Each structure stands twice: as structure tokens, then as C-alpha cells.
Design a protein around this motif. Structure first.
Motif, mmCIF file in Angstrom:
data_model
loop_
_atom_site.group_PDB
_atom_site.id
_atom_site.type_symbol
_atom_site.label_atom_id
_atom_site.label_comp_id
_atom_site.label_asym_id
_atom_site.label_seq_id
_atom_site.Cartn_x
_atom_site.Cartn_y
_atom_site.Cartn_z
ATOM 1 N N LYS A 126 5.040 -6.764 16.810
ATOM 2 C CA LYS A 126 4.831 -6.175 15.495
ATOM 3 C C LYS A 126 5.184 -7.151 14.372
ATOM 4 N N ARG A 127 5.639 -8.369 14.695
ATOM 5 C CA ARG A 127 6.140 -9.267 13.663
ATOM 6 C C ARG A 127 5.505 -10.649 13.683
ATOM 7 N N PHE A 128 5.039 -11.099 14.843
ATOM 8 C CA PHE A 128 4.457 -12.418 14.963
ATOM 9 C C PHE A 128 2.954 -12.282 15.122
ATOM 10 N N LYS A 129 2.244 -13.344 14.771
ATOM 11 C CA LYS A 129 0.808 -13.402 14.946
ATOM 12 C C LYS A 129 0.508 -14.775 15.532
ATOM 13 N N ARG A 130 -0.382 -14.843 16.524
ATOM 14 C CA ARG A 130 -0.682 -16.110 17.168
ATOM 15 C C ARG A 130 -1.819 -16.814 16.435
ATOM 16 N N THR A 131 -1.616 -18.093 16.098
ATOM 17 C CA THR A 131 -2.614 -18.874 15.384
ATOM 18 C C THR A 131 -3.599 -19.497 16.367
ATOM 19 N N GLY A 132 -4.635 -20.135 15.814
ATOM 20 C CA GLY A 132 -5.671 -20.782 16.598
ATOM 21 C C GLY A 132 -5.124 -21.848 17.545
ATOM 22 N N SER A 133 -4.152 -22.640 17.080
ATOM 23 C CA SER A 133 -3.589 -23.700 17.901
ATOM 24 C C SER A 133 -2.587 -23.145 18.911
ATOM 25 N N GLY A 134 -2.256 -21.855 18.801
ATOM 26 C CA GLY A 134 -1.390 -21.208 19.768
ATOM 27 C C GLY A 134 0.053 -21.101 19.289
ATOM 28 N N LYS A 135 0.302 -21.480 18.033
ATOM 29 C CA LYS A 135 1.607 -21.303 17.420
ATOM 30 C C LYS A 135 1.788 -19.847 16.995
ATOM 31 N N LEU B 196 9.263 -16.768 -0.646
ATOM 32 C CA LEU B 196 9.546 -15.831 0.432
ATOM 33 C C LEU B 196 8.335 -14.951 0.717
ATOM 34 N N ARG B 197 7.434 -14.839 -0.254
ATOM 35 C CA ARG B 197 6.277 -13.975 -0.126
ATOM 36 C C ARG B 197 5.255 -14.557 0.849
ATOM 37 N N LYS B 198 5.285 -15.873 1.085
ATOM 38 C CA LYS B 198 4.319 -16.508 1.970
ATOM 39 C C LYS B 198 4.737 -16.350 3.429
ATOM 40 N N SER B 199 3.804 -16.637 4.342
ATOM 41 C CA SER B 199 4.112 -16.658 5.762
ATOM 42 C C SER B 199 4.808 -17.967 6.127
ATOM 43 N N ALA B 200 5.289 -18.030 7.369
ATOM 44 C CA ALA B 200 5.983 -19.190 7.898
ATOM 45 C C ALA B 200 5.648 -19.325 9.377
ATOM 46 N N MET B 201 5.908 -20.498 9.954
ATOM 47 C CA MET B 201 5.720 -20.685 11.384
ATOM 48 C C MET B 201 7.063 -20.522 12.086
ATOM 49 N N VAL B 202 7.012 -20.096 13.348
ATOM 50 C CA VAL B 202 8.197 -20.059 14.178
ATOM 51 C C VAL B 202 8.581 -21.494 14.530
ATOM 52 N N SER B 203 9.877 -21.804 14.412
ATOM 53 C CA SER B 203 10.386 -23.140 14.682
ATOM 54 C C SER B 203 10.265 -23.468 16.170
ATOM 55 N N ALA B 204 10.218 -24.766 16.476
ATOM 56 C CA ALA B 204 10.122 -25.251 17.843
ATOM 57 C C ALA B 204 11.231 -24.663 18.712
ATOM 58 N N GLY B 205 12.460 -24.709 18.198
ATOM 59 C CA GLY B 205 13.606 -24.206 18.933
ATOM 60 C C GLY B 205 13.467 -22.726 19.260
#
Ligand SMILES: [Mg+2]
Ligand SMILES: [Mg+2]
Ligand SMILES: [Mg+2]
Ligand SMILES: [Mg+2]
Ligand SMILES: [Mg+2]
Ligand SMILES: [Mg+2]
Ligand SMILES: [Mg+2]
Ligand SMILES: [Mg+2]
Ligand SMILES: [Mg+2]
Ligand SMILES: [Mg+2]
Ligand SMILES: [Mg+2]
Ligand SMILES: [Mg+2]
Ligand SMILES: [Mg+2]
Ligand SMILES: [Mg+2]
Ligand SMILES: [Mg+2]
Ligand SMILES: [Mg+2]
Ligand SMILES: [Mg+2]
Ligand SMILES: [Mg+2]
Ligand SMILES: [Mg+2]
Ligand SMILES: [Mg+2]
Ligand SMILES: [Mg+2]
Ligand SMILES: [Mg+2]
Ligand SMILES: [Mg+2]
Ligand SMILES: [Mg+2]
Ligand SMILES: [Mg+2]
Ligand SMILES: [Mg+2]
Ligand SMILES: [Mg+2]
Ligand SMILES: [Mg+2]
Ligand SMILES: [Mg+2]
Ligand SMILES: [Mg+2]
Ligand SMILES: [Mg+2]
Ligand SMILES: [Mg+2]
Ligand SMILES: [Mg+2]
Ligand SMILES: [Mg+2]
Ligand SMILES: [Mg+2]
Ligand SMILES: [Mg+2]
Ligand SMILES: [Mg+2]
Ligand SMILES: [Mg+2]
Ligand SMILES: [Mg+2]
Ligand SMILES: [Mg+2]
Ligand SMILES: [Mg+2]
Ligand SMILES: [Mg+2]
Ligand SMILES: [Mg+2]
Ligand SMILES: [Mg+2]
Ligand SMILES: [Mg+2]
Ligand SMILES: [Mg+2]
Ligand SMILES: [Mg+2]
Ligand SMILES: [Mg+2]
Ligand SMILES: [Mg+2]
Ligand SMILES: [Mg+2]
Ligand SMILES: [Mg+2]
Ligand SMILES: [Mg+2]
Ligand SMILES: [Mg+2]
Ligand SMILES: [Mg+2]
Ligand SMILES: [Mg+2]
Ligand SMILES: [Mg+2]
Ligand SMILES: [Mg+2]
Ligand SMILES: [Mg+2]
Ligand SMILES: [Mg+2]
Ligand SMILES: [Mg+2]
Ligand SMILES: [Mg+2]
Ligand SMILES: [Mg+2]
Ligand SMILES: [Mg+2]
Ligand SMILES: [Mg+2]
Ligand SMILES: [Mg+2]
Ligand SMILES: [Mg+2]
Ligand SMILES: [Mg+2]
Ligand SMILES: [Mg+2]
Ligand SMILES: [Mg+2]
Lengths: 63, 97, 73
Positions: free
Chosen positions: A11-20, A43-52
Motif C-alpha cells: 500500500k506504500r511502495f510502487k515498482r518503477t520500470g527499472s525495478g526500483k 516533502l510533497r514529491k516522491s522518493a526512491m527506496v535506498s539501497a540499504g
RNA sequence: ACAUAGCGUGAGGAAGGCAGACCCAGGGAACUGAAACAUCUAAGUACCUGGAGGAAGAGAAAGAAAAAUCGAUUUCCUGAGU
RNA sequence: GGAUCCUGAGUACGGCGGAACACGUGAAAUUCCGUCGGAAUCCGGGAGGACCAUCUCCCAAGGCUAAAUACUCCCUAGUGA
RNA sequence: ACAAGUAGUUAGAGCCCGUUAAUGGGUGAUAGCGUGCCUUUUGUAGAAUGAACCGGCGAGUUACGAUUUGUUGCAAGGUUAAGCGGAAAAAGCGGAGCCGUAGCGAAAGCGAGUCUGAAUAGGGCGCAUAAGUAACAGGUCGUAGACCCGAAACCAGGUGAUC
RNA sequence: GGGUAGCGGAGAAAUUCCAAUCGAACUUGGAGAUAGCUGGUUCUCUCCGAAAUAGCUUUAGGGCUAGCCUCGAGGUAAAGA
RNA sequence: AUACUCGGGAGUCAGACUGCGAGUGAUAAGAUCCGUAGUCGAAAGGGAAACAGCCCAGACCACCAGUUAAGGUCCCCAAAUA
RNA sequence: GGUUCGUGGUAGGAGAGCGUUCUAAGGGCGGUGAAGUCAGACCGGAAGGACUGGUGGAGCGCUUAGAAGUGAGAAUGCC
RNA sequence: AUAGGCCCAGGCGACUGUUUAGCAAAAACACAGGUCUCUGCAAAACCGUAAGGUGACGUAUAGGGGCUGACGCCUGCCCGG
RNA sequence: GUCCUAAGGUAGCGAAAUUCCUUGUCGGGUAAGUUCCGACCCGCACGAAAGGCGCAACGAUCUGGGCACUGUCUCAACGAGAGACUCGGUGAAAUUAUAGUACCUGUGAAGAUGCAGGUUACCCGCGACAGGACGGAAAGACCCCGUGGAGCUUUACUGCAAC
RNA sequence: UGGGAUACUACCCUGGCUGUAUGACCAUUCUAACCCGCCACGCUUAGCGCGUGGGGAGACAGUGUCAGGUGGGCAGUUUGACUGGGGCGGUCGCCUCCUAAAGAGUAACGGAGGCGCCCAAAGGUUCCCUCAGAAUGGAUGGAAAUCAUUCGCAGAGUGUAAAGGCACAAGGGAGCUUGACUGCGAGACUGACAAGUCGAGCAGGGACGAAAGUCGGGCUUAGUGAUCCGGUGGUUCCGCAUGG
């Protein structure tokens, strides 16, 4: 048995084209007197999940 | 689990909803229409027989990506503005079934 | 009654004299003007000095007591 | 008082057992998981009780749908870890 | 053919309290239990996930029904990297 | 039978043998060097733990998913499931479905773009820099007791006042 | 000879007794409960080879991400020393 | 002569002493807590009688060969009664 | 095939192997003595492997592949 | 052979009894007596889901519960909580 | 006087099964008395049915003193039996890494039969004694730790019976 | 007589209060449900039960459903960590300084202090300015108030701790203002992550200024708290057959 998807994450993450994984930012309900307009725009923009974090959680959201 | 530090997924908010009526179209880029013979009438039924689109989810949409050479008559449920122009620019007619 | 301290704020030079920087590169983090904005350098709201254009960083004497940092393309 | 209860006789029938299985019903835990714990989980599981039958249960639409139609139920594959 | 008559009532449903539904009362349809209230009845009734209208599909509150499924105390014949 | 010994080892006479024939075997006066094994530890000869000895038995497995590497087949495609057929076969049949071939967006949607935005701006994610899929094998993870042994306890149905 | 039975009895009261068991009997089952703890984990050689730190943590003898090890692959104003 | 990037697999989160620089302490501790280097940890060999952490120095195997390090050369005990 | 630099090592990563039971196929041994067992001064870099002789008295190797109840010195382990 | 050692004085408990089977026999428990309080009988109290029981085949001079503990002399003040 | 309270402890008793200071002080008893008895009251922190203060009788109760008496002691001696010991018969156990198992001073995980340097020491037993083997026994009960139990409490939280 | 008038008047209305439509609400009585651990009779050789007749009780009680209260009688649990052992005490997040060894970072129950706000100007801009203290002279007037001259690099000030800054002021006046803007953002810092920090420049539309230009709060660095769940406003989004 099949692995179960972590529904909280689904319900919180979305998978991108590259698989991130793309996510939203935290501090984005209430307490907006305490944040600057610049903070708010950022803060209003999206972000990517960190590698860690991605290493820790990727099995939870395979599928 | 992070040994009691609040896990990542709980630090960040839930977003959005799922549409009960979400339509997803089977996508056909122009490039694969070159497969067909010139002056031919390309239908969905012809696009599944040949084996270009197996499951026609919600319908067949034609997208531009690639460039078409042959002069066809393509009927699909949807066309991208670019796709329509390109099918016509070659010398064909699009119909929206 | 003691036992308190704030987080260290990582002040000081962030790019070397003679180093090429891109526009927006933070050159110096500081409280007040230990070092002054030179040519092609800006002073941010918290006194952070940043390059306004690409080029080479040069820390220079202003006059006797003061010091400035400039970015020369 | 009529009569009912009661009492007697004669016919039928039941009773008990179990395959430590499967099935349907009544009743129904806790440890455990949640890195504590109360909602939640374990689980309608274990267990007890009753009813069975060779199977049981379900079943011939006050149904599924909404590609425009299907035509009782059950079981498998899939849908989907949606 | 459609003058008339019949087509499952303390039922359906509702309130309150629970349960079953993947669905923890939720916006909560559907199904059941206790309790109280309580219809229409062919010009009728139900459902399509609150609810109303339209349309569509159905006709509850009676019963029976093999097979495809589960299991093996047993019997017979066999099998096993 | 004048010796102070984790018991061997290196050097080594003497004596006794004679082999899978080897710069051999047994024993060992004397000399040098030398604090078992395991576990657990910053550190154990340890005056920390465990084992009397010998023998047998005794601990990362399987199923189903995920992911990654290797291999093979086919390739913008790849693959069938249940089932039918059959010998607890092999094929054949079975394309339902699944993954891939397009993304962006909460969504309507638009689409090599899309979202944000008044924007033909900038920026995010994508495209331009095509390879996947099926199977098997290795590694690791998930659900299962999940490497093995071990509580005190908790709950359920029974059995006990011959003490 | 009898009665009272474990979410229970019985107690001139001690947490006292209920079959050499009692701050809650015994037995079978749930059950291979759970154990961030202790112990244990079996053949060989070759190559490489740590850490005992930071941050957060009802966290402090646990864990997670990072740091440090290893195996494979990639790519070049070679960026390392 | 490595760096970096992307993947697969880890272990570690009790450290110890020594030297130097500080705090705490009493300018005590084989104390405690940081910084910095080394050794041990995970390192056998030589020296320091014995002696993880000091001095010297890194064990692929064999040799009844040689040269050196710290430390030594009267005897135990190899080498100067230099 | 040479050259150069290497080859201490706990947790741990990587690799190549030994041996055990079973299966398949091939090829063998064995009452003129199988396995097991005992002994030995043999062979291989290790795990290990032969040979000879005694005992034993009927089954067992080898090659290539496959599959695992596959290797014990410690568990105050169990018998 | 078998058969009380005694005395003076103090603490505690009046007394005979009871108790931690198996480390405590006591100053602990009990006790007669005191007091408070509940209970009008289908009593209160207690066991049991209930029926049914105990109380009691009793009836306030009785029954249940709390505290105190022979006897003697006594038992003060505070009802704000 | 004065502040506060609902009200400020009466009788009795008091260094006490209660007194910290404390072996309080004084008296008694003794040659000498931290105990005991009697007084005193500055009651750390007695006190009236969680009764106060007395109290004949009673006690395997606790405490102090005295007489009797004695191997309790000065301080030990002798005798009896049982065992010990020798022989004949029978024949366990806990424990146990292997042991050819000295002493001193040192060293070392900071307390050594086993390491160093010395010092002693012929080989094998039997009767005795316990200094050491951090001896055996029992995975320390103390102490801490575990997001372990369990029993108990309440104006902890949430519940449930009952009313 | 007063801002309000007296009568008629009609919408009304206030205190008392009668008829008429309700309604529950009490209160008493009744008997026929229900009850009887009362009597007599029967089933019946029965201190159970049931039946019949009396008596008693009675719309109560009892029982079902629902509701509030009381409720360690009983139950499930929770009851933190650090710590020169534990407890007791203290501490827990954020800012500044010293420790800190002249980059950055760096521990201790080491040494010192602050914060959980404030300000409509104490923000923006334009223009103008210069402070502390002392000496000397002077009404009330004192050591010290307000004048005046001189000397005065800052010995002041800077909302608030400290450090770093600041006299082209960042300190002090005044005029106009709301940039304490909307969309953003190359690129950097910091960093395990979550977060945190700086940012030229672009577009929209502004404030001040003649212009140059400056302005996305405040000399800088504290003044804060995630997710989930709820509330409010908006909305060219979805709306479980279709319109809602
Ligand atoms: Mg919001
Ligand atoms: Mg710090
Ligand atoms: Mg600012
Ligand atoms: Mg847990
Ligand atoms: Mg309901
Ligand atoms: Mg449910
Ligand atoms: Mg409906
Ligand atoms: Mg109802
Ligand atoms: Mg309905
Ligand atoms: Mg609907
Ligand atoms: Mg729905
Ligand atoms: Mg009908
Ligand atoms: Mg001799
Ligand atoms: Mg001699
Ligand atoms: Mg032992
Ligand atoms: Mg795999
Ligand atoms: Mg319980
Ligand atoms: Mg019984
Ligand atoms: Mg008896
Ligand atoms: Mg017993
Ligand atoms: Mg279980
Ligand atoms: Mg077990
Ligand atoms: Mg190496
Ligand atoms: Mg927490
Ligand atoms: Mg550890
Ligand atoms: Mg050091
Ligand atoms: Mg130390
Ligand atoms: Mg270690
Ligand atoms: Mg060494
Ligand atoms: Mg030596
Ligand atoms: Mg060692
Ligand atoms: Mg040499
Ligand atoms: Mg030489
Ligand atoms: Mg010599
Ligand atoms: Mg080497
Ligand atoms: Mg090696
Ligand atoms: Mg490996
Ligand atoms: Mg065999
Ligand atoms: Mg044999
Ligand atoms: Mg095995
Ligand atoms: Mg053994
Ligand atoms: Mg007595
Ligand atoms: Mg007595
Ligand atoms: Mg006893
Ligand atoms: Mg006794
Ligand atoms: Mg009764
Ligand atoms: Mg008493
Ligand atoms: Mg009494
Ligand atoms: Mg005296
Ligand atoms: Mg009183
Ligand atoms: Mg009293
Ligand atoms: Mg008394
Ligand atoms: Mg005396
Ligand atoms: Mg004898
Ligand atoms: Mg020493
Ligand atoms: Mg010693
Ligand atoms: Mg010695
Ligand atoms: Mg020893
Ligand atoms: Mg011992
Ligand atoms: Mg222990
Ligand atoms: Mg213990
Ligand atoms: Mg409790
Ligand atoms: Mg529990
Ligand atoms: Mg603690
Ligand atoms: Mg200490
Ligand atoms: Mg302490
Ligand atoms: Mg520094
Ligand atoms: Mg909402
Ligand atoms: Mg709709």
C-alpha cells in the motif's frame, strides 16, 4: 505455500520500470506550522527506496 | 524487522486507491504491423490469430513507437494521436471498433 | 547536572583551493562570516558560501584581518 | 359425574460396540505469533458430546452476471498471494 | 384463454445483542442465532455489497436426489534407487 | 631399583631381529626440546567447562514459494495447468492461464512518453542504450518443528482420599 | 465400611495435607509449546580472510542498516597508494 | 598497484595490552573512557628464566648447508676469560 | 610450456576432491574361496587406496552417471 | 531391677488441647469468655448452571460473619478522610 | 502567648519479645555481670478488644540466680564390648582426560604435582592423619540478567462472575 | 401626565385556571395468568412429583432479551533503559561551548549553560545614522535621569544560552510595504535509513527603489514528534449493472 506479499508495503511502495521502489515521504500529515514552505514542496514529491532499505525489504514485495 | 527501530514501511504514508473499473489495453506498436501484407485489413481477430497479441485485455490500442512502411487498414479499440497520424501518413485508414 | 551537548554541525571548508567546482557547490559551512563571499560566490541564509558558476576555488586575503573565497572559470 | 391420569396385557422398535480414519452438528482451549501485550493470532485447531453413512455435506436459482449472456451441486487447474 | 381463485406468516424484514461471511461494525450488502417489533401477498415479492430510482436477473419462508470428492480397521494381487 | 617424568619428539649407543627391500623392523642407556583434547573466552596447561573406557546410535532436511548464479531448448517470444490417453510409461492432445514484449499517473487517463505545473519551463520515473521464457542444478531467503538436544510453565479430557 | 477431587477439596491455620509429588496432584493429549539462553553439530586439501565499530532499537551478552571479508561481473583522463 | 560500480554469500557489534595525546581517578590501579600507532585476538619461530598483548621477526614441504636480527659470547649454554 | 609475484591464519567466503549405502548401464571377480575380520616394513599431496598372508564360508568390486538416513571424540548425549 | 532433683526470680501465653508427615511445638492456632454486625424463616450465609441441598428436621436465649481471647481493674479523644 | 488540625495520646505502663544513640544512669546480685532483677523517664519509634495494665494455677516455653550433683572442665587414666587389624568365605559404591603424580621461590587467566630456576628424592607395599589435588556430591538457592515462569496484592490496565 | 395611553380594537401576551383530544405518570383495588419450602383428597403401602379442591400471594415475584452501576470475589496481563554489581538518586529529545590532540568526526553517571518560544515588526526595501563609559559645566536632581562640549574600534548593541560574526554594519532612526510569495530548482553539504541543510537560476505575479538592484522571514546555529486513525476546507479523480 506461496510467499505472501507484505500488504502494508504494497500500500506504500510502487515498482518503477527499472525495478526500483518509489515511495512517499514521511513528515506529510499535520504539524505543518513547524515545516517551511521549502520543506513542504520537497516533502510533497516522491522518493526512491535506498539501497540499504531495498536489500532488507525486496522479498517482502516480490510480486 | 529492524530490531525495534520502526520499520521503513511504517515511517511513510499509504497512497492512492485502486479503480474497480480500471481498463488495461493490449498494446501494439507500429513496427509489428509491417509483418502484414500491403492493402490488408488488420482486425483484433487477425492480431490474435497471427499471434501478435494473445490476451486482448479491455481492447487493442495501437501506439506509435517504431515506424510503419505498408499501407494498411487498421481497426482497434483505441489509437494514440501519433499512431493514427503515422498509419495515415503511410496511406491507410484507422477505424475505432 | 551536566551531560548534554548538541550534534556536531560539520562546519569548515568543503572544497580545496585550486579544485574545480560545479555551480551550487558548497565551499564553506560557517556561523557568521569567518570567510566572505568573493567573486562568483554567494552567502546562503545560514552563512554557507556556495559557487554561483563552475570554475576553480581560490581562498584569498581581503585586507589584513579578513579572508574571502572566489570561483574563477 | 362423564372422563382423563394411572395400571395391565399384546405387538413393533430402541439400547451397546467401533477404523485412535473420513463426514455433519452441539460445546470449545491454551501454549504460541505479534520479538512485551489486551484487539488480533494460534483456531473454530486440540479435546469432549451427539448424529451418522459408505461416504457425508451440497444441490435443481427469490443464483452468477452485465464481453450479452449463462443455466443444480460437488471436486481439480486458474484467477491470486490479486 | 386471463372473469375470479391459488402460489409456503409470527414468515420476510427491522431494532437491540452475538456469530458466520477472506470482510475485526465498518459506508457493510449477504447468511444464521437469541430477544422484541413485524409486511406485501400478483396492480405481488427478492437480488445486483449502505441507500433511492431505472433496468436486468430471479420467485424465499416445504422436501428428495446418483456421479465426479474424502478416508482405510480390512480383503486380493502387486510395487519400491 | 640415584630417579623429579602431559610420557612424546629429535640425537643416540648397546642388544634383539630380518621386511610389501626400504638411505629396514623391535627396544631404548644417555642428551636436547616439550604445560592433553574440546568448549568458551580480551586471555585457559589451566586451580573454568565436558568426556571412566570401548562399541553402536546421535544434528542444515524435505515440500511449496521468492531471488540469484550456472547449464540447456526455443526466442520477441517462451511455456502449458488440471485433465484425456495410456504400463504408477513415452508421446500426442489440452493455450484456460502465467511471464515477457511500455511506461507514467492516486485516478480519469494519456502513451515513447507521462506526472507535476498556468507553462511550449524545469524536475521525477521511463524511452532512446530490446531479451525473455521453460526446465534442471548450486547459493541464500520465506512458510512449515526447519540444524539437534533441554526448561520452568499454560490449556484440555481423564485417574486418584487403600497415604 | 464410607463422603468431599485440582478453576477443586480438606485445614484448632503451617502455604498445611490430597498415594515418598503441592504458592496449586497425577496422567494422557494440544506437543517436536516457546527458549534473543547454555551445550552440541561428524571427511580432506587449495585460495582469500574479518570484526569486537557508528547509528537506531523496552536496546544494552539480541537485532537491523552502514563499516570491515569473500565470490562473480562490469566499466574507463585510471579514477587507488 | 590498485580504486570504483552492480550482483551472490558472510561473519562481527564482550575486545586486550604496549607506546604516545587527553578526560575521569589521587597526574592510583593489570582502573575507566576517547583519540592515535602497533602487537595479540587470528601468529608459529628467536630474545626477555618461566611470561597472549614488550624486543626481533612472519611457518608451502624436505636438507646432518650458509648469512644475519633482537639478544649474546667464564660454566650451566652456541659464540671473546676480545 | 615459461616468466614474475605469491602460498601463517579464527569467524567466514570461494574451489577441487576422498570415502559410505543404494540405482542404471557396461565390464568383471568369486568354493582354485566373496564380504567381513586380523597382521604387515606398500602406494597417493590429504581425505584415502592396494598387495600378501591368516581367519571366514557366500557373496562383492570396477567404470561412467544418478540419488542420499553419506563420514563423530566431546551434547552432565542414548543403549 | 524398676519408680520425682529441688529452690528463688522474671518475660510470654490464662488453663487441658492443636501445628509446619520428613530441619521450627512456640510467645503461633484453638479455647471458654467479651464485643460488633448480619439474619423474621423459601432466614442470612454457603455449595450448585439449575434442580437439589447444607443452615435445620433449627427459628433471634437461634443461626452466619469480623475482631478480641480465662479471670481482675479498665478500655480515653477524633466522624474531616 | 502563637501556628496548625477531624482531633492532638487519658489511665496504665515504660531502655520493654518495643530504646537507634546504648554496655543510658543509679541501685542489687558477682572477686569481676554488654545478660538478669529494681528504680529513673529525653517513649529514636508504648498505649487501651491488630486491647492496656495486673494475675493464682498451668508450660518438654524463653530468661537470670542458687543448692544438690557430677569426667562438662583443670587433665586426663584404666577397664568391657562392637568395629578397626590378621586369616578363611563372599564381595559392592561414589569418582575417573591419559599419568612414571616431591619441595621451595618465582611465573602464569593475577593462589602450580605437571611451567622456570633451584632444593631434595633407591624400587613395592601395610597401619594411620587429613594440608592440597581451588577434592566428591548438586548445570549456586545468594547476586544480576531473560521484553522467562509462577503465587500473592492493590485506589496498575482491561476484563468476568455475582449482586 | 410620557421615549411608551388610557376607549373601541385585533395580532397577541403574562400570571392564575375551567371545559374539551391525547398521553403516559403515579396510587389503590381486583383475579384469571405466574408462584407457594401451606392444608385436604387421589394416583399410592411415597416427607419426590403430578392432578383435584381450599387457602395465601399476584400482575408483583420468577424466568428470557437489552441497558446502566458496583465489582482483586475471580481472570489475563503490564509495571522501561542507562548504571564502575543491582536498588535508591540522577538521566533520556534539541541547541552552544570546553574536553577534541590547529580539516571533519570522536567517549565517560566528564566540565559549563540554554530550548519546547517570540516578533504584524523584532519581517521586506529605500534613505539616513553610530555605540559603552569617563572628564568638565549646569534648576528641580541625589553616585546615577534629561542638556552641552571633549576623548572614545567598540570597552555597546544584536528579542533569547553560548560560540562564530557584525561599526560599507548584521547595531540605531524614519518613509512606503507584506517576498513571513505560488510553481519549482542545476548542483552541493550532511547522512546506515528516516530525516536534516544550502542553493544560483527559470516562470507567474508583486513590494521597495530614480535606477542598479534587493526581497521565497528574523546576524547565524535551538523553539520540536513519524506512521495509523480521526476532524475541517477544497477538488477538470474513482463511484461495484446504470444515474446518483
Ligand atoms: Mg493531509
Ligand atoms: Mg558530541
Ligand atoms: Mg532563516
Ligand atoms: Mg516474542
Ligand atoms: Mg446482527
Ligand atoms: Mg470474520
Ligand atoms: Mg439490499
Ligand atoms: Mg432479530
Ligand atoms: Mg435483504
Ligand atoms: Mg449496486
Ligand atoms: Mg465489495
Ligand atoms: Mg414464488
Ligand atoms: Mg640405575
Ligand atoms: Mg645422589
Ligand atoms: Mg567430568
Ligand atoms: Mg535457486
Ligand atoms: Mg490460568
Ligand atoms: Mg473418584
Ligand atoms: Mg479409612
Ligand atoms: Mg506427600
Ligand atoms: Mg500447537
Ligand atoms: Mg520439547
Ligand atoms: Mg593471506
Ligand atoms: Mg520503542
Ligand atoms: Mg557474543
Ligand atoms: Mg592506546
Ligand atoms: Mg583495562
Ligand atoms: Mg574470539
Ligand atoms: Mg608469537
Ligand atoms: Mg624460552
Ligand atoms: Mg592461545
Ligand atoms: Mg642459520
Ligand atoms: Mg656469522
Ligand atoms: Mg661454550
Ligand atoms: Mg609465509
Ligand atoms: Mg592458508
Ligand atoms: Mg562454501
Ligand atoms: Mg554390502
Ligand atoms: Mg568380524
Ligand atoms: Mg548421519
Ligand atoms: Mg562414546
Ligand atoms: Mg499455651
Ligand atoms: Mg500442653
Ligand atoms: Mg518439621
Ligand atoms: Mg521438632
Ligand atoms: Mg434453598
Ligand atoms: Mg490474638
Ligand atoms: Mg470468641
Ligand atoms: Mg549493678
Ligand atoms: Mg478504642
Ligand atoms: Mg484497637
Ligand atoms: Mg493479648
Ligand atoms: Mg552465671
Ligand atoms: Mg578376608
Ligand atoms: Mg604474576
Ligand atoms: Mg604460585
Ligand atoms: Mg621446578
Ligand atoms: Mg592439576
Ligand atoms: Mg568441589
Ligand atoms: Mg548455573
Ligand atoms: Mg538456578
Ligand atoms: Mg490478579
Ligand atoms: Mg499469554
Ligand atoms: Mg538495568
Ligand atoms: Mg566497580
Ligand atoms: Mg554501582
Ligand atoms: Mg577539530
Ligand atoms: Mg478518511
Ligand atoms: Mg453504481
Amino acid at each position: 505455500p506461496k510467499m505472501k506479499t507484505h500488504r502494508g508495503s504494497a500500500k506504500r511502495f510502487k515498482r518503477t520500470g527499472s525495478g526500483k521502489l518509489k515511495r512517499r515521504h514521511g513528515f506529510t500529515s499535520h504539524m505543518f506550522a513547524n515545516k517551511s514552505q521549502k520543506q513542504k514542496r520537497k516533502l510533497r514529491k516522491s522518493a526512491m527506496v535506498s539501497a540499504g532499505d531495498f536489500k532488507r525489504i525486496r522479498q517482502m514485495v516480490a510480486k | 524487522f529492524e530490531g525495534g527501530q520502526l520499520p521503513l514501511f511504517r515511517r511513510i504514508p499509504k497512497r492512492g486507491f485502486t479503480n474497480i473499473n480500471r481498463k488495461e489495453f493490449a498494446i501494439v506498436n507500429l513496427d509489428v504491423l509491417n509483418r502484414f501484407e500491403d492493402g490488408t485489413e488488420v482486425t483484433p481477430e487477425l492480431l490474435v490469430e497471427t499471434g501478435i497479441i494473445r490476451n486482448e485485455k479491455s481492447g487493442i490500442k495501437i501506439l506509435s513507437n517504431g515506424n510503419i512502411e505498408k499501407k494498411l487498414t487498421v481497426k482497434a479499440n483505441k489509437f494514440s494521436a501519433a499512431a493514427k497520424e503515422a498509419i495515415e501518413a503511410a496511406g491507410g485508414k484507422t477505424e475505432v471498433i | 547536572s551536566n551531560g548534554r551537548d548538541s550534534e556536531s554541525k560539520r562546519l569548515g571548508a568543503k572544497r580545496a583551493d585550486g579544485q574545480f567546482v560545479t555551480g551550487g557547490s558548497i565551499l564553506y559551512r560557517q556561523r557568521g562570516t569567518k570567510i566572505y563571499p568573493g567573486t562568483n560566490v554567494g552567502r546562503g541564509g545560514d552563512d554557507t558560501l556556495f559557487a554561483k558558476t563552475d570554475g576553480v576555488v581560490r581562498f584569498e586575503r581581503m585586507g589584513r584581518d579578513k579572508k574571502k573565497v572566489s570561483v574563477y572559470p
